[PDB]
Amino acid sequence: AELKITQVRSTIGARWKQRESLRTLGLKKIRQSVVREDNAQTRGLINTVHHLVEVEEVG
Amino acid sequence: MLIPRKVKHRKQHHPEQRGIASGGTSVSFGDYGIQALEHAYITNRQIESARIAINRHIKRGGKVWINIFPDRPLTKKPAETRMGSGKGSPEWWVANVKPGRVLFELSYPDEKTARDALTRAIHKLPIKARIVTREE
Amino acid sequence: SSSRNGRDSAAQRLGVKRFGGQVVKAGEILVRQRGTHFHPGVNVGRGGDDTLFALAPGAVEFGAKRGRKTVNIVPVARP
Amino acid sequence: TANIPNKLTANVRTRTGKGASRQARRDGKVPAVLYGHGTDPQHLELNARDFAAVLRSHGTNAILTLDIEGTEQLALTKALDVHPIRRNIQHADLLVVQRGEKVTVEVTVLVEGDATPGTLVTQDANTIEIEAEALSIPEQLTVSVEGVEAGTQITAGQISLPEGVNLISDPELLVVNVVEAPSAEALEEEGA
Amino acid sequence: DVRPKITLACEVCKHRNYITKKNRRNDPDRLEIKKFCPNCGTHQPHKES
Amino acid sequence: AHKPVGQNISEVRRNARLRRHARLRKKVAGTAEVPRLVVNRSARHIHVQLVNDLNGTTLAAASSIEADVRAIDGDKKAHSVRVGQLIAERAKAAGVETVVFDRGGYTYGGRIAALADAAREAGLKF
RNA sequence: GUUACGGCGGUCCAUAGCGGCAGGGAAACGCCCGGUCCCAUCCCGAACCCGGAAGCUAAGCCUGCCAGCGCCGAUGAUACUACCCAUCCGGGUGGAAAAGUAGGACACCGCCGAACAC
RNA sequence: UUGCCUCCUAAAAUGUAACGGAGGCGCCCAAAGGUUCCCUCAACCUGGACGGCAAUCAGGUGUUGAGUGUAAGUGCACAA
RNA sequence: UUUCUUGCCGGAGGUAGAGCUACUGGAUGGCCGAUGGGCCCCACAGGGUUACUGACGUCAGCCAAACUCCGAAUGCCGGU
Ligand SMILES: [Mg+2]
Ligand SMILES: [Mg+2]
Ligand SMILES: [Mg+2]
Ligand SMILES: [Mg+2]
Ligand SMILES: [Mg+2]
Ligand SMILES: [Mg+2]
Ligand SMILES: [Mg+2]
Ligand SMILES: [Mg+2]
Ligand SMILES: [Mg+2]
Ligand SMILES: [Mg+2]
Ligand SMILES: [Mg+2]
Ligand SMILES: [Mg+2]
Ligand SMILES: [Mg+2]
Ligand SMILES: [Mg+2]
Ligand SMILES: [Mg+2]
Ligand SMILES: [Mg+2]
Ligand SMILES: [Mg+2]
Ligand SMILES: [Mg+2]
Ligand SMILES: [Mg+2]
Ligand SMILES: [Mg+2]
Ligand SMILES: [Mg+2]
Ligand SMILES: [Mg+2]
Ligand SMILES: [Mg+2]
Ligand SMILES: [Mg+2]
Ligand SMILES: [Mg+2]
Ligand SMILES: [Mg+2]
Ligand SMILES: [Mg+2]
Ligand SMILES: [Mg+2]
Ligand SMILES: [Mg+2]
Ligand SMILES: [Mg+2]
Ligand SMILES: [Mg+2]
Ligand SMILES: [Mg+2]
Ligand SMILES: [Zn+2]
């Protein structure tokens, strides 16, 4: 199991751990997406920025 | 008037006036009571007026329990003065009331007269309250 | 028209200086305090103003010993 | 005097929490927990409407027959967490019980009848603790006032206690005190 | 002053080694105590100056 | 039945002795290389243990209830010196010559001093 | 190895405490007897210190049982909260008490020595 | 009012402003410093000529509510 | 890469909340009942009667920036 994360909101007005979680996820602009494994580190890293992104599993 | 005989500190901060009354939310002394619904500062002026209202209405025999005490002082700096020069001198007394706290409680034989005296008291308070009975 | 108060002293920056599992040198002071809120533990000494310091290199770790919060230095193994 | 247990339905809470409890409370259901010597704290949603109805009919202290997914259990209401304002029952506690089992409980005491007119009757302790069987629990017991003499106290030790039930409170706990009705020149003299 | 500054000098070499305080109301006489003299090399009596 | 009301001298002696022992213990302790020589004393016998407080174990021990010590017709000081030499020999066998003296909450002197000086001359440096 | 044993310890030092009832004196632990000697009382051989074994389980000590007081204490709910929604109201996802209840508990672990078949 | 010390504000690390809320300091002690050893208070009940709740004596209950030169805070009965 | 983020691990707190028979203060109503109040027989002995005031205590409900038997979430220090 693993996920695809797409950024929908932007980082203007966003607190700093949110922007850094986005940068750590490897995505920079809106509508940009990344695909990555479904461990606990990723689950927490997207838990921080759930309001800025949307995720869906593959398969 | 209800005034504490002494307070350890006579100039406190304004009581935090948020949340729901956790302690003191049940009718225990008498059978009918007035139970609050809004946050406020019930001064001893309000309490005295409400108690006299209840006593005037029932006027015969029955027990009125003021189970809130005004013991928190609100200060007021003298008029016509600018800002600064320190905090003022305390000159009225307050009970901090949350939504949920039974304020006045009454014991009296009949029903309608008791209810009417309780609403006569309610009209003297700066809040919305409701009459609550000794049973669930 | 005047306040009869308005004086205070400097903050003395008291408190725990090294927390649990933290490697220290021998001699590092570990917690500054007034009374004895933390009592000296194993291989930990106490200074004149009740400042706890480490009498040996190791890792800081707290404990309770007969209802007394204590601070101890644990010898880490030499690599 | 056996009291017939009341028959509710319940079903195991799938997942726990404040969100789950709020949702269940929103669907007209009461979250509750079974415990006792059944040694299994079991988390049960039950019908809010039926719970309130049976609490109306048989007070706070009444045996229930819970149907947990077909299994049949006897329960007794231990505590009810109720909102101070909205007055809805939020949570319930259910000891597991069986026949011939003494249990400690608190029973409301409602003064009955009229008193002598020159004085008012006033209760200090509305609830009295009793030891009694699961089925034989009285939902309420009465205390006699019929033209008392001048002001006197009443304690739990002189109440007509039911059969098969035992007082737990120390007998010298006052329940109802007749106190002389305040005169015209006595009623407004206290409170300031 | 009532607690003035005083000096202590070794008797056997007359060198002033220490300065301290004492109460004149309570210790009217010269204070003398066995202190350490760096050049005498040992502990010697020291008397108020 | 005859219920006694007072406190007995046994209680005060025992717990005051324990308090003195603990006050002492705030400042001495035993390692493997410099163990602790703890002493008990009663109206009949004197006891010694050689303790490594890192473990709560005992390395050597002696008392005045052994065969030879009860074989002495002498005085309580004689029993004390015998116990001292025996415990010194047992410590030396165990591989130790340095120790700290835990006098056990009794005042240093009398038979405890005799024991301690017997151990001192016998080879244990303390 | 057995012990209705004696010491020295440990435990986020009461789940170990207080109290109550019922037992024990092998060696031990005590009390007990005396002040010749070391040593001692801001007076007192009461304490401490030194010598002794006439009497004792009445205590101290230890053993067994009681939950009366003190102690410990969930599950669930609730309070509060981080972040996020949300035009005041309020809600969602994570964390989650205090009090109370069910109950628990009359401690457990270690190393030496004593007597005992050895 | 202006330097120093202690507390609360101060939002459980540290730090944090106002003519915010309360107080202290400008010393004292040749012992009230060092070490060695010993002890446990305050309060309460009971029994005692002055002597009264109260002064010193005796018995008991009493784990900290007393005391710690000196403000306050943190400590200290293992005792400081 | 020492920076920063996320997961896990090792920590120290006294805030929100709560509690108060756990302290310091405030504070509601009961209950018993003093000591001290008055009176009788008649002494200012002694005894009891009485709106007595009603110490202490106790039952139930409460309150606090400078209260705390308790007590989070976050943040903070370190490691990984
Ligand atoms: Mg606040
Ligand atoms: Mg309430
Ligand atoms: Mg509260
Ligand atoms: Mg109104
Ligand atoms: Mg400060
Ligand atoms: Mg010092
Ligand atoms: Mg200094
Ligand atoms: Mg002098
Ligand atoms: Mg006696
Ligand atoms: Mg206990
Ligand atoms: Mg025997
Ligand atoms: Mg003698
Ligand atoms: Mg016995
Ligand atoms: Mg014994
Ligand atoms: Mg407890
Ligand atoms: Mg929980
Ligand atoms: Mg809106
Ligand atoms: Mg609890
Ligand atoms: Mg801070
Ligand atoms: Mg902070
Ligand atoms: Mg600033
Ligand atoms: Mg000044
Ligand atoms: Mg001193
Ligand atoms: Mg000295
Ligand atoms: Mg005494
Ligand atoms: Mg990390
Ligand atoms: Mg952690
Ligand atoms: Mg912690
Ligand atoms: Mg604080
Ligand atoms: Mg609060
Ligand atoms: Mg106060
Ligand atoms: Mg607070
Ligand atoms: Zn010289």
Side-chain angles (χ1 to χ4, degrees):
Chain A
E2 61 86 19
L3 306 172
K4 187 177 99 160
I5 298 89
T6 311
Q7 185 180 356
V8 299
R9 298 294 88 193
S10 88
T11 51
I12 315 180
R15 291 167 65 175
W16 191 79
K17 296 183 289 294
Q18 298 155 353
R19 319 194 308 260
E20 294 294 328
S21 302
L22 286 185
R23 172 183 82 74
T24 307
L25 279 162
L27 60 83
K28 291 189 178 184
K29 286 177 185 170
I30 291 167
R31 260 179 197 169
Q32 212 185 309
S33 68
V34 293
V35 64
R36 65 179 62 251
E37 202 261 330
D38 197 5
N39 52 9
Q41 176 189 6
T42 295
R43 181 67 68 192
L45 205 58
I46 77 182
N47 172 28
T48 297
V49 291
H50 54 295
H51 68 287
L52 302 173
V53 303
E54 61 86 20
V55 308
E56 75 257 23
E57 66 182 1
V58 308
Chain B
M1 296 296 172
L2 279 299
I3 297 169
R5 289 175 296 172
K6 64 193 162 72
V7 285
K8 199 168 188 171
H9 323 98
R10 47 194 267 284
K11 300 195 197 179
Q12 302 111 320
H13 294 161
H14 284 159
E16 280 189 353
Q17 184 177 2
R18 45 174 271 255
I20 300 301
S22 66
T25 49
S26 296
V27 62
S28 44
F29 295 91
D31 62 358
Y32 308 110
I34 298 163
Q35 185 266 332
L37 278 153
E38 293 179 353
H39 299 91
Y41 289 160
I42 304 287
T43 72
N44 44 5
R45 291 291 161 112
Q46 279 103 13
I47 292 184
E48 185 62 20
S49 67
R51 179 191 81 87
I52 299 165
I54 297 176
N55 300 140
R56 296 288 76 160
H57 192 88
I58 56 181
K59 92 186 165 289
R60 179 71 274 171
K63 197 72 174 296
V64 182
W65 283 278
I66 313 173
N67 63 7
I68 58 167
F69 198 86
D71 45 349
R72 310 196 52 66
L74 294 195
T75 178
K76 182 267 289 180
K77 63 185 291 187
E80 301 270 307
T81 62
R82 297 180 169 134
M83 294 296 172
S85 313
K87 188 173 176 67
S89 47
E91 66 98 21
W92 60 87
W93 298 87
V94 175
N96 181 39
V97 165
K98 314 283 185 65
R101 175 169 274 271
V102 180
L103 295 175
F104 295 92
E105 183 177 1
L106 176 80
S107 76
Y108 201 80
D110 78 323
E111 293 180 352
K112 184 178 184 293
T113 309
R115 303 286 198 94
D116 302 342
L118 291 187
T119 192
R120 213 62 46 92
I122 284 167
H123 269 303
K124 298 281 150 56
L125 308 183
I127 57 172
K128 290 190 165 62
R130 67 184 176 197
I131 300 179
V132 298
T133 300
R134 197 170 182 85
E135 269 74 20
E136 171 208 341
Chain C
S1 57
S2 311
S3 48
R4 299 201 272 107
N5 47 12
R7 305 147 311 262
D8 192 74
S9 66
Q12 316 296 325
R13 276 77 166 165
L14 304 183
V16 178
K17 257 65 193 173
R18 298 281 174 279
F19 301 83
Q22 193 159 0
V23 180
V24 298
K25 306 263 196 66
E28 283 206 41
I29 62 171
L30 302 172
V31 57
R32 311 218 88 154
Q33 65 183 357
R34 286 302 95 208
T36 301
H37 182 211
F38 291 100
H39 286 258
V42 65
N43 221 344
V44 159
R46 171 198 189 197
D49 54 0
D50 317 302
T51 299
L52 276 299
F53 65 101
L55 295 166
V60 185
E61 61 86 20
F62 299 79
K65 180 67 173 66
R66 184 176 176 87
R68 294 178 67 188
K69 288 194 94 85
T70 57
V71 187
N72 318 277
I73 287 295
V74 164
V76 295
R78 189 268 304 279
Chain D
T1 46
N3 197 1
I4 56 167
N6 305 102
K7 184 178 184 293
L8 270 74
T9 179
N11 63 6
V12 291
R13 284 177 91 250
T14 65
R15 59 89 173 174
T16 313
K18 64 182 178 181
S21 296
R22 283 172 190 174
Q23 195 69 336
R25 203 170 284 125
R26 203 171 297 125
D27 291 331
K29 295 177 148 304
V30 175
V33 60
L34 293 174
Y35 57 77
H37 48 277
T39 61
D40 274 331
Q42 201 183 159
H43 318 98
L44 277 296
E45 292 179 353
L46 60 83
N47 195 356
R49 178 70 191 174
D50 290 20
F51 200 56
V54 62
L55 287 154
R56 267 176 300 192
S57 302
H58 314 282
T60 304
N61 281 136
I63 301 299
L64 320 170
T65 50
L66 274 297
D67 173 272
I68 320 296
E69 267 79 25
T71 48
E72 182 65 26
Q73 296 294 321
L74 209 69
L76 178 48
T77 299
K78 181 69 176 177
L80 280 73
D81 165 62
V82 58
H83 206 275
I85 294 170
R86 291 185 299 290
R87 186 179 296 276
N88 58 345
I89 303 144
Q90 269 178 335
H91 192 266
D93 299 344
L94 279 299
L95 291 172
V96 298
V97 287
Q98 78 268 16
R99 308 297 184 99
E101 177 188 10
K102 300 287 97 175
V103 70
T104 65
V105 67
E106 58 289 338
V107 168
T108 190
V109 174
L110 290 149
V111 67
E112 182 65 26
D114 197 2
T116 180
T119 175
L120 73 164
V121 65
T122 48
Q123 65 182 177
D124 303 336
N126 60 345
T127 301
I128 298 299
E129 288 178 351
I130 55 151
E131 168 186 356
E133 210 276 353
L135 57 82
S136 74
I137 176 168
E139 192 273 330
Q140 57 93 26
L141 57 92
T142 187
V143 286
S144 73
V145 62
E146 289 100 330
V148 193
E149 201 175 353
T152 192
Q153 304 96 11
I154 289 175
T155 61
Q158 63 195 7
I159 316 303
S160 67
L161 191 67
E163 67 273 18
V165 299
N166 313 118
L167 182 63
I168 279 167
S169 286
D170 55 332
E172 199 68 3
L173 163 69
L174 194 153
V175 186
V176 298
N177 182 7
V178 168
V179 69
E180 274 201 50
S183 300
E185 59 88 21
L187 186 142
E188 67 281 5
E189 277 73 4
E190 81 257 21
Chain E
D1 291 331
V2 71
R3 281 200 88 96
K5 294 179 181 180
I6 57 151
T7 317
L8 303 165
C10 184
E11 276 92 0
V12 309
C13 77
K14 280 76 59 185
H15 283 195
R16 289 138 75 84
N17 290 316
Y18 305 101
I19 174 160
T20 178
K21 291 183 140 209
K22 60 98 176 178
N23 201 308
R24 64 165 84 268
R25 179 66 65 192
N26 288 327
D27 291 20
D29 291 331
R30 293 171 93 138
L31 176 71
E32 73 203 44
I33 50 172
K34 272 174 74 74
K35 301 301 290 187
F36 174 86
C37 203
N39 63 4
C40 291
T42 53
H43 269 72
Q44 305 277 47
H46 282 62
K47 182 174 71 68
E48 184 176 347
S49 296
Chain F
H2 175 274
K3 177 62 182 75
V5 65
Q7 202 168 22
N8 203 229
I9 195 79
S10 296
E11 266 197 358
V12 303
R13 176 157 328 179
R14 190 176 174 87
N15 61 26
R17 195 214 65 90
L18 283 146
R19 188 161 179 89
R20 292 191 281 277
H21 192 51
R23 158 163 60 238
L24 188 154
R25 285 273 280 116
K26 263 153 59 159
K27 193 179 286 184
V28 310
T31 64
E33 75 275 9
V34 188
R36 172 179 48 124
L37 184 65
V38 68
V39 175
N40 295 112
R41 186 198 99 245
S42 77
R44 273 177 256 256
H45 303 284
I46 189 166
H47 311 277
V48 303
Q49 302 184 359
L50 183 63
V51 184
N52 176 22
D53 302 288
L54 294 174
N55 283 347
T57 56
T58 303
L59 277 297
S63 48
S64 64
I65 64 186
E66 267 86 354
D68 44 347
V69 177
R70 267 176 194 194
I72 306 167
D73 67 345
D75 205 50
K76 288 186 167 174
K77 278 96 161 189
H79 299 125
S80 282
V81 302
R82 208 54 189 82
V83 172
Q85 304 165 14
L86 276 195
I87 192 54
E89 283 164 61
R90 294 176 193 177
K92 194 150 72 67
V96 65
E97 293 179 353
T98 317
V99 75
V100 303
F101 196 83
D102 188 358
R103 75 197 196 260
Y106 316 111
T107 72
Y108 185 80
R111 54 207 289 190
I112 291 187
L115 176 86
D117 308 352
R120 269 184 192 86
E121 62 86 20
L124 269 293
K125 41 165 75 59
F126 67 91

